[PDB]
Structure 1
């Protein structure tokens, strides 16, 4: 709910336009965006190319890493800098198995062979990595390393700023739509946005555009609907902006049905990675049963995915869901037994690990430490409740939803290159348009280091694309003006109809952003496998969801906004609605349940490797208002065995 202190209204024709011409435009200054800005600045010199970074907030703390992070979740270690060395083949296997068999191995292997270099640079730039007395990076699990990352984003932000220059970074500018080449219907030409600090419409003209807006949250009703609706596990700052503008431009989406349901400390959603992997904490149900044991047999039907190590996250979630459905809650993270076991009676050792435990929270999800403080929970004395949050859509973490992107020429098989007009690393099906981090689908487990890395990869590819193809996109001035009118329409609608009621938020001719969002969340929660149905859905529910989303979409044409802040909220809602529609259509298309634990199609309860071991890709045609789906069979690209 939003109650503005005062009005801040503007009519489109009263707002000045600022035109910015650049070569490479990066939308989103988070981890992937900063990686792209950093790398782009390096190669751009070859053509004296201009690189521009646009961020809706402030790069110093914007995005998922605003609080910092307690670990770097992706570090292969090909030389032995950490406590455990790994191979690229094992990593690729790991990711494909976690995806229950569906991952673009050309893309995963690609970021994997580059990620360690990125991590090494991070340390070079000042990031303190936990080290053993011998100087080795401290491992959390097999693929992550612990870090003192409270300032993780500010450090990465400084690197990006130093590389591209502050004069090339636009902050507090919300991008709401892409612009296509007047000369080519399947080529990008820039993007439009508006400032949230003053009345100013932005028109960015570019030869290459890179989507780095992060994923999408608040599509689904959370487990807390009051103030805590703000405590989303994934970044509340990411609202599916890249998904919206990219899909509207005609860029194909992939695996958009693949949401991620995070099992974390209840309510605060504090991290469990260190507790499980580092502190060796056990999770038990209300009766003291360690369900990863009692529910192990139930995974036998998922051969050979259920035999993988570690066990695929969705299957781990599935075990949790079975406990929840059986009514065995609360589920507890027994931190008290974990700390006692690790300390071994050594009081000084206990103090040390105790400090490590709190840093794991204070370095990335302070709310959990605050929750413990408010509820008088001392982890050395009593266990904490854990629970799965509502669904989130992103492609950098454990979820792989995002755009279908091209891979490196030396790894991408012919089977995966068919839909790309131009073969450039991380380019979408739309010429000149790239997608990275959460925006790039089918290659998850990138996390902070991998996302920054994918950004670097796309940036170099963007410079290569520009110097080789030599594009010269022309924006359509008529479309730009149309978009400018649409941009501020909500403010004009508020002014035009507010007089119908004595209350600004109860009007029959318009809906405010928070009102449309409440509606979106209820629809998705009840029909799209949200928490309301313990992540279950079927054809009928999904079809009803499309019907309700249709009404909502029509009502977006009657959105109102009272100030610039709410105008951004209005467009963030628009972005989420289309993201939600794509998600529902993807879930409706795939007739199987491959990721039990993330969602269940009760009408197709089994995993089908005979007919569905494929990536589901879709394209939305704005002109015809039609969605087209395609199945791209998975092919093993990298050598590995179960």
Structure 2
């Protein structure tokens, strides 16, 4: 061995909500666990989550997990896996109450119970009257959650490797994942973290776009790592554009604003969601609201100003008290990034890349899947995935607000609970050879040796521009085909890209170059997938195939990295505790 080998039962790559929940569970269950993160854990994108956690606690009114299941299934436009969704909605309450017992500082109803607000796609009695099931700490729920989980990891004395950058999965000769290589950002040392279970919890990839609500660190590292290891990724075309990022800045203002009574206006003062979604109005599914805002703009009823084209998000009628109490975070974001006081003036907002529904396909246990020559599901031994990086799929073609924080916790916890069984089921994994480990370093060595190649800044801009223009809210076949050709060229340029900083002590340039490879793989898988799905479903909308096609496309799309070609996986329609919700026409 050249490289130092640090061995654990489990190595968790990512310390957002999902990886911190999993680490905690894995550790409590008796196993050693190294928790890796390329930033200090509390700076993960989870800290920015605002509106809260969607869960049928039944505090604000009587609720029912089956109602939440219905809203989720319908919200996913019928490609969410029903058994998984069932598991999530049913387990949610217990999983969330346990965060409260960890000290999470939830807001409170007068009687002492956790506060829940209305949110998009929430109904009573299977598509009836508007519900309020999003549990919140003002509009800083993600902050509250991440800090609480970090605190619990301290309490538990979790072994945390902070500011370590995971480079690539290590595979053995049998095809099993047996850990990853990682770069210590402070010192530049490279190490092999050897494990029986490598848990990807690396989060989303909004930074493949020109405008995103996501942190700079959301670079799809887990997608790139998967793809380069030959592990497929699923539903990559399904990118949620949040209806309301601040126009000109990309910074999120929560759906909580509309949950609390706020609403969208156009240049004429029309509350147009009443036309586009007569029942759910401004609390319709996100795919619908986003498209609606864009149609208002394309048709010339958008507003303008220094922010560029936008709709108005009117909140002032809520009053100072409610705003400061329930939505203080957006008051601050709006004043800083829009120069608009929401107490007096509407926030200028536009749909903005927000969340990756796609990812590495997994079971409820967190075990990652691939497919064989026959198209049959096969567990990838040694590999697991939780959180935004995973595609369980609980969110299908369109995620409900609040369902992501719930997913982190439920599925992070599940991977931990089931880890012993999963490790026993996969059996003993053969050791990585020296050359297996070295294969994981090829990508880093290319960077360390390339001095005279192309500027990676130009490459990153070309990539983001291509995704914004061709793979946004509305898609056209010709433009998608041309975008894909454009990405192929860009990806070729990336193979000859230079690293201009060769140093070893806290070299962030090397990190950002490594991230760029992952932006490229993620964009590339997205583009291929998006060209493939010849229908419109949830967040995927195409003018050449405007209809939802349940005969041909009631399924997941699967990107196969060895052949760079596409295939399909079944959608689960077999919940255990209640009947499957059949596909029907989906209007809000």
Q: Is the 8 A contact 2:450 2:496 kept in 1?
A: yes
Cα deviation 1:164-202 (Å, max 9, x = unaligned) = x34x211111112111122x12x2111112122112112
Relative to structure 1, is the Cα distance of residues 354 and 310 closer, same or farther in structure 2, using a 3 angstrom cutoff? Answer: closer
Match of 2:491 among 536, 553, 560: 553
1:473 match: secondary structure:
coil
Which residue of the partner structure matches residue 95 of structure 1?
72
Higher strand share: 2
| C-alpha RMSD over aligned residues | 2.7
- Indicate which of 227, 230, 233 corresponds to 1:247: 227
Q: Deviations over 1:223-280 (max 9, x none)?
A: xxxxxxxxx31233221111111122232322111101111143343423222112x1
Distance 1:418 1:576, change over 3 A: same
Structure-1 separation of matches of 2:3 and 2:465: 37
Q: Quote the offset at 1:594 in angstroms.
A: 1.5
- How far apart, in 2, do the equivalents of 1:538 and 1:145 lie? 38
Aligned to 1:359: 328
| Aligned equivalents of 1:277, 1:636: Cα separation in 2 | 32
TM-score in terms of structure 2 length: 0.85
Q: Which residue number corresponds to residue 23 of structure 1?
A: 9
Within 1, Cα distance between the matches of 2:458 and 2:242? 26
Structure 2 partner of 1:585:
528
Q: What is the deviation of 1:26?
A: 0.7
* Cα deviation code 1:537-558 (max 9, x no counterpart): 3333222222222222222222
- Give the 3-state SS of the residue equivalent to 1:465 in structure 2: helix
- Decide whether aligned partners of structure 1 residues 103 and 50 sit closer, same or farther in structure 2, where only a CA change above 3 A counts: same
Shift of 1:357: 4.8
Distance 1:307-1:121 versus aligned 2 partners, 3 A rule: closer
* 1:188 correspondence with 2:174: no
Tell whether 2:151 aligns with 1:174: no
- The structure with the largest alpha-carbon Rg is 1
Which 4+ residue blocks in structure 1 deviate beyond 6 angstroms? 306-309
Counterpart for residue 387 of structure 1: 350
CA shift digits 1:510-545 (9 cap, x unpaired): 123322211211222233x23xxxx33333322222
Uncovered stretches (5+) of structure 1, i.e. residues with no partner? 1-12, 223-231, 298-305, 340-349, 395-399, 410-416, 422-428, 498-509
Partner of 1:462: 419
Measured in 2, the distance between the counterparts of 1:88 and 1:537 equals 35
- 2:112 & 2:375 partners in 1: Cα distance? 47
Helix, strand or coil at the partner of 2:240: coil
Q: Contact 1:33–1:452 at 8 Å: present in 2 too? A: no
**1:576 maps to what in 2?**
519
**Which structure 2 residue ranges, 5 or more long, are not aligned?**
119-131, 304-310, 367-373, 502-506
Distance (whole Å) between structure 2 residues aligned to residue 456 and residue 110 of structure 1: 12
1:431 matches 2:381: yes
- The Cα of 1:606 is off from its aligned counterpart by 1.7
Q: Distance in 2 between matches of 1:70 and 1:556?
A: 35
Task: Note closer, same or farther for the CA distance 1:562–1:470 as it changes in structure 2 (3 Å cut).
Answer: same
- Report the alpha carbon displacement of residue 491 of structure 1 after superposing the two structures with TM: 3.1
Aligned to 2:123: none
Q: Aligned with 2:429: secondary structure?
A: coil
Three-state SS of the structure 1 residue aligned to 2:90 is: helix
Aligned residues: 537
**Aligned partners of 1:42 and 1:109: how far apart in 2?**
26
Q: 1:639 aligns with which of 562, 579, 583?
A: 579
Q: Give the alignment partner of residue 206 of structure 1, picking from 195, 206, 219.
A: 195
Give the Å deviation of 1:481: 2.3
Q: CA deviation at 1:206?
A: 1.1
- Structure 1 residue 111 displacement after superposition: 2.3
Matched, 1:447 2:436: no
CA gap 1:120/1:178 in 2 versus in 1, 3 angstroms: same
Deviation at 1:28, TM superposition (A): 0.6
Q: Is the 8 A contact 2:364 2:415 kept in 1?
A: no
Instruction: Determine helix, strand or coil for the equivalent of 1:23.
Output: strand
Aligned-partner Cα distance in 1 for 2:84–2:213: 26
Residue 39 of structure 2 corresponds to residue 62 of structure 1: no
User: Which residue of 121, 143, 147 corresponds with 2:133?
Assistant: 143
Name the CA shift for 1:95/1:629 in 2 (closer, same or farther; >3 Å). same
Give the whole-Å Cα distance in 1 for the aligned partners of 2:580 and 2:442: 54
Residues of 2 paired with 1:553 and 1:24: CA distance?
Answer: 33
Residue number in structure 2 paired with 1:50: 32
SS in 2 for 1:262: strand
Matched, 1:262 2:242: yes
